[PDB]
């Protein structure tokens, strides 16, 4: 104690957390219009960013 005193746990992005992660990424690369993000998140259940 006095070096590390607090522990902050990081878990996974949630069912509506996973949603946000798509949005940053699609913008970053090139795309022709995509909108299927409501389905894609269910397929991608339990994924890391």
């Amino acid at each position: 104690p006095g070096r590390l005193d607090r522990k902050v746990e990081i878990p996974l992005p949630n069912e509506a957390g996973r949603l946000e992660i798509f949005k940053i990424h699609t913008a970053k690369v090139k795309k022709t219009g995509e909108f299927d993000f409501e389905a894609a998140v269910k397929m991608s259940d339990g994924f890391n960013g």
Binding site: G2, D5, R6, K7, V8, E9, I10, P11, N48, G49
Partner: protein
């Protein structure tokens, strides 16, 4: 709460007398993006 509060004012922690608290262990499965969060915390403070 851990970092930002005592940095602006060490002044409140000093009134109470309890030490301003430091040391955070970040953990979780890889790809969590906790190194990305390292940036976001210090982005608010504009900290180096």
């Amino acid at each position: 709460e851990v970092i930002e509060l005592p940095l602006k004012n060490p002044e409140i922690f000093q009134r109470v007398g309890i030490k301003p608290p430091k040391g955070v262990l970040l953990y979780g499965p890889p790809g969590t993006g906790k190194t990305l969060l390292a940036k976001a915390v210090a982005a608010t403070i504009g900290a180096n």
